[model samples]
Target: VTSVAMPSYIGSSLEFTKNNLIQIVGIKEANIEVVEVTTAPAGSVEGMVVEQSPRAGEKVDLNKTRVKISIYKPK
Candidate 1:
């Protein structure tokens, strides 16, 4: 099967993640889903990506796979 890794962004800033998502993963904006969470480790900010589906490096169908991410949202 022609598949690619789902791409990882955990612990990375949102801007940086998006950059890779578009430039490397070759996924579209519509396929990128995002969620906000109030919990985060020290020094984390809204820009921080705390989690992702497929957990990065997992095989995926990049052509249609939807990517969801959990970003930091201070409570």
Candidate 2:
């Protein structure tokens, strides 16, 4: 399951089942679907997409970035 970060700017959150990240970024020329979301690591910005690869702007043969987000999980 792929993972992505929720943007912290809006102060609003999302809970998606079919497509999450694409809801914001949208399915690019490819058919990317942000499959999952996990809290990022420390010393990281709240909403900045800290982890994505084929990265961002890369031509993806499939859909979304094969990634796992680094979100902040409170202790």
Candidate 3:
């Protein structure tokens, strides 16, 4: 049994997604998917995190967990 600490990046900026995780965690396998959002919880427009995969807090612990984060793009 193995595990680690990777929290939710939801409700955050997409830029911060890459900047923080990619920059600090040095996560490889990171994926960025952009979409549109008419409504959001908080933060600026076109940059909010809509959803993610594996959901760290509710998810994984090994193999460098796949980094998947979807962002919003204003039209």
Candidate 4:
């Protein structure tokens, strides 16, 4: 698959899904890392991608791009 630049921002506070991240966003599943945290807002869902690395709009090597997907959790 051809790689493209990452988006500067996803859904601001809206919930996201694995398919939304992998399929629609074109984020390589291999390059994604999931990290859990409890500081997300009350409505932050479990798989919601709260934050991402490399900011966005940055061209990255599809194979080398390492993305951190900060997820929400209850304290």
Top lDDT model? 1
In terms of TM-score, how similar is model 3 to the real structure? 0.58
Model 1, 34-73: lDDT tens digits are 8898898787777699988868789767677888888998
After aligning candidate 3 to the native by TM-score, how far in Å is the CA of 34 from where it should be? 5.6
Error of 2 at 59 (Å): 1.5
TM-score on alpha carbons, each prediction: 0.82, 0.29, 0.58, 0.60
lDDT of 2 by residue, 1-75 (tens): 333443332222323311444455444424432323345555554444444444444443334444333322333
Off by over 4 Å in 4: 1-3, 8-17, 41-46
lDDT value, residue 10 of candidate 4: 38
Q: Which one wins by lDDT: 2 or 3?
A: 3
Write the residue-wise lDDT of candidate 4 on 6-69 in tens digits.
7654334323544555777776778777777777655666556666675677665667778776
For TM-score, the strongest prediction is: 1
Stretches > 4 Å off in candidate 2: 1-42, 62-74
The lDDT for every candidate, in the order shown, is 0.80, 0.38, 0.62, 0.63
lDDT of 4 at 61: 61
Task: Give the Cα error of residue 39 in candidate 2, in Å.
Answer: 8.3
lDDT for residue 11 in candidate 1, whole number 0-100? 87
Residue-level error in angstroms, candidate 4, position 56 = 2.7
lDDT (tens digit, per residue) of candidate 3 on 1-75: 444556688878877866766566555543434455656556655778877765757544445466667676655
Error of 3 at 66 (Å): 2.3
